[PDB]
Amino acid sequence: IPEEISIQERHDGASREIDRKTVVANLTDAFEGSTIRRRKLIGLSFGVGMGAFGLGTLVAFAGGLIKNPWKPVVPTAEGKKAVLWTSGWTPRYQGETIYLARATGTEDGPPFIKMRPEDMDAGGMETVFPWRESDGDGTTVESHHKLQEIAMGIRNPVMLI
């Protein structure tokens, strides 16, 4: 392909004076032929109406997402508390036994087993979860779901040393 050089002559800067004058004349005639300059009640009415419609529509469009973080939804032994203050280590009926259960990683019947003091050495660390006997092993579907909800909790895991 042959080699070339080309020059373009930008023609940059502000527009030509005839162009500027004609555009301004068009817009000015459009604005002052409508007489809107002397209808203050109509200007105010349009402003108020559009403001009300826009605000109502925006509030309706954005209101479905907003949720109150502090409403009591979690049942405890002292009523109902907000999610961000409860853990799963919180007692539910004033005296319930919550064990420190360790995970087996297995899917046979237990994914969580109890612990005794002698099930560890003086240099051991173990991750433990709250057991709550009424959950049982994960043989039935309801117990499987309870154990899944135990395992998927961001404030559940505890380090025992």
């Binding site: 940059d12 800067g13 502000a14 527009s15 030509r16 162009d19 500027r20 004609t22 555009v23 068009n26 817009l27």
Partner: peptide, 17 residues
């Protein structure tokens, strides 16, 4: 806006369509 983009003729052409 004129000294930067200078339409002022395409704008008029579309305003008079």
């Amino acid at each position: 806006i004129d000294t930067r983009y200078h339409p002022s003729a395409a704008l008029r052409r579309q305003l008079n369509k």
